[PDB]
Amino acid sequence: AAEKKSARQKKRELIAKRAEAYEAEYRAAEREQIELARKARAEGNYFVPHEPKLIFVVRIRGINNIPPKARKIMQLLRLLQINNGIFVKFNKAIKEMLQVVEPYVTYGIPNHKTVRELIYKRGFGKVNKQRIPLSDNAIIEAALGKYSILSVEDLIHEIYTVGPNFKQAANFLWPFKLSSPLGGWRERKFKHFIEGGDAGKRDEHINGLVQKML
């Protein structure tokens, strides 16, 4: 009776401390990058920000008239439907995947708000091969307690910062089922994003697209 209430109360405070620690980390990382860029500019030096280990990929072309070589990759990316968004560990083994499914998907660097809103609204966990909504921290705790992930904030951190267990967290998240964008795509959507279309890599504009889709 009292033991479970005390343990859960202490667990609640522990999550609060972790979330406070994570929030400070994001603020410090953003502030320190700004300070580094400011000092480089003052000295005349050029500062290169680090590569983004995280990418968010949205499938923009349907299941019709797609070559088998490209189809298998979206099967491996769990992009089995149009307007489906997933997190991918951006590395040298993924850059080549996304370069050959350039005409069929779009991707970019998601900021903290994009990841935070996606898991809050579209966050569904794969529990016993079922799509269970992440409606409470105990759902995540029983499914990711081995990797010391206890709450939604812990899951957001493990996804945003690409921690050691990013593969387990990304595989736990059922692919986000995003709606059609509010306001629509561009006039011609299947042209490359650079050439005025809406396909391929788009860097920090994946956020502006995702907010439409949420």
Partner: protein
């Protein structure tokens, strides 16, 4: 259990359930209240206003 899905962003009560930290967040902080140091190298300005 969980007959209906409630969006934490639109539900202040569900947000409290999921994230026991939103009760103390302090979103806006005033940090540009000291002498704003205009930080721009003169060589950088020449390169910027080049050609």
């Amino acid at each position: 259990a969980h007959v209906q899905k409630k969006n934490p962003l639109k539900n202040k009560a569900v947000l409290s359930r999921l994230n026991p930290y939103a009760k103390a967040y302090k979103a806006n902080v005033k940090i540009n209240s000291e002498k704003t140091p205009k930080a721009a190298g003169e060589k950088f300005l020449s390169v910027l206003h080049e050609n």
